[PDB]
């Protein structure tokens, strides 16, 4: 019906937190996926940017 693109920057260590059912500083206080999330999480190193 729609696709929502959510976009942001984090540490490389924290990419593991951008998943359903995760916890941690980013998952808890910044950005939470629902436990039954349907979607894809796409990330790339941006040290050159």
């Amino acid at each position: 019906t729609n696709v929502y693109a959510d976009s942001f920057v984090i540490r490389g260590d924290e990419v593991r937190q951008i998943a359903p059912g995760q916890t941690g500083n980013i998952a808890d206080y910044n950005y939470k996926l629902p436990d039954d999330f349907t979607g894809c999480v796409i990330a790339w190193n941006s040290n050159n940017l």
Binding site: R11, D13, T23, G24, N25, D28, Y29
Partner: protein, 49 residues
């Protein structure tokens, strides 16, 4: 601690007769890995051992 053990001679410390706010550890940004087994890191502040 300023120096840790070698893994072949890994240190063990009893933590006892005390109150632990595990959420200080868990939502710290410092730890690159914080994986819990048989317990959930959020509910860890609700338990005793």
């Amino acid at each position: 601690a300023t120096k840790f053990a070698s893994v072949y001679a890994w240190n063990r410390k009893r933590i006892s007769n005390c109150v632990a706010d595990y959420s200080v550890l868990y939502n710290s940004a410092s730890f690159s890995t914080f994986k819990c087994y048989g317990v959930s890191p959020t509910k860890l502040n609700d338990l005793c051992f």
